[PDB]
């Protein structure tokens, strides 16, 4: 949760380098978890193969996070509109393009751009409007 | 789905062992009988939501009796201070603590 607090604490549209670093850390953590699950469920033939798979997944996730944070913060700075979800959408589409590049497929890139950008815009909207993915029971 | 068959039929199938303050063989008291009794009496019929905050003092005392976390922390701090003073040479344990006097029967 400390990484999420790190990403949130940096003001939007400011300290773009720190925001990119936080996004990269989050992407790396997610990639590490995915790599652990992949190694367990689908066993790697060798320790070197497991390390290669972990590195590939982690680098892809970290690149996605870094591109998302860098592009979103830079767009927020240049447009100068901090709370606009379009910045998050641009960052998400850039992340999807990065995923397509890492997977060396155009179709993956385009589908990821659309879906990931929309999800990031929705996340920004949830920040602005106070949407709760997990709601404390209040009845 | 907790069908309280025990309460409906007046059968004490397992409630006898539920708490440490309940009746025990030869009236052997629990190590925290007083705190447990106080906490149970405080949180009786007021509901869990209320009892979680209106009897928090009782529950904290019960937990302290059970685990002795605060007492152990204080004892460790006192021992650390005593050891530091001994290292500094400004403290000397009393003869009775050192074993030079017969303890009271």
């Amino acid at each position: 949760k400390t990484l999420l607090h790190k990403y949130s604490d940096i003001p939007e549209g400011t300290e773009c380098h720190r925001k990119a670093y936080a996004s990269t850390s989050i992407g790396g953590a997610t990639g590490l978890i995915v790599s652990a699950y992949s190694i367990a469920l689908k066993p790697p033939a060798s320790f070197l193969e497991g390390v290669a798979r972990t590195g590939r997944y982690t680098f892809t996730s970290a690149a996605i996070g870094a591109i998302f944070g860098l592009t979103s913060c830079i767009s927020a700075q240049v447009r100068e509109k901090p709370d606009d979800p379009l910045n998050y959408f641009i960052g998400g589409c850039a992340g999807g393009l990065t995923l397509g590049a890492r997977t060396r497929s155009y179709g993956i890139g385009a589908a990821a751009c659309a879906y990931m950008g929309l999800t990031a815009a929705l996340v920004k909207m949830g920040q602005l409007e106070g949407w709760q993915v997990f709601a404390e029971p209040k009845v | 789905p907790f069908f309280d068959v025990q309460k409906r039929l007046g059968l004490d199938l397992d409630r006898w062992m539920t708490i440490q303050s309940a009746e025990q063989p030869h009236k052997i008291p629990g190590r925290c009988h007083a705190f447990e009794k106080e906490w149970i009496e405080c949180a009786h019929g007021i509901g869990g939501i209320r009892a979680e905050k209106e009897c928090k003092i009782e529950f904290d005392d019960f937990v302290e009796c059970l685990l002795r976390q605060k007492t152990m922390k204080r004892l460790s701090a006192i021992k650390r201070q005593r050891d530091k003073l001994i290292k500094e040479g400004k403290y000397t344990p009393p003869p009775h603590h050192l074993g030079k006097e017969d303890p009271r029967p």
Partner: protein, 175 residues
């Protein structure tokens, strides 16, 4: 050194667990389980639980006997593995011992270690109570209340054991 018999025994317990958990051949894992059972008996006796500890030792001593026979029958291998016969078993053993040594030194040195809960390095003697039990063994009186207070537990456990005999017979029928 006798001020911390409990800690030494608990460390031996954890080492036995790291032995049978690294999964050598079932024989040496049974050796580890026997050692850990003895050490646990020691700990419980140091805390005043002579009957309970002796009972654990007796029950696990018999249980590991059937395990040993079963191993020589089903879980058998031409070259049974010791904790130094495979890189995986030795890796697990070394990792377990190192993890213990790590937490052991950490808590002993640091006043208050907190791995997942908060642990105080003060010796176990501190927590002990100052009361007197008189002409009684509280463990014995409590364990004997299973027949006077725990009629329900006796019913459940007896039924469970009879049904366990039935269950073993059915599971081993083999059609």
């Amino acid at each position: 050194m006798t001020m911390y018999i409990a800690f030494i025994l608990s460390t031996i317990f954890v080492i036995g667990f790291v032995g049978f958990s690294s999964k050598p051949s079932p024989i040496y894992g049974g050796l580890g389980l026997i050692v850990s059972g003895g050490v646990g008996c020691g700990i419980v006796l140091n805390f005043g639980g002579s009957f309970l500890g002796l009972m654990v030792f007796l029950i696990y001593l018999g249980g590991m006997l059937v395990v040993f026979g079963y191993t020589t029958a089903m879980a058998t291998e031409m070259y049974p593995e010791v904790w130094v016969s495979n890189k995986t078993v030795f890796g697990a053993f070394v990792s377990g011992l190192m993890m213990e040594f790590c937490m052991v030194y950490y808590a002993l040195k640091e006043e208050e270690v907190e791995i997942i809960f908060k642990f105080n390095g003060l010796g176990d003697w501190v927590i002990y109570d100052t009361g007197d039990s008189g002409f009684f063994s509280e463990e014995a009186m409590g364990i004997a209340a299973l027949y006077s207070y725990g009629t329900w537990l006796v019913i459940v456990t007896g039924w469970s054991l009879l049904i366990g005999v039935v269950v073993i017979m059915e599971i081993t029928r083999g059609n």
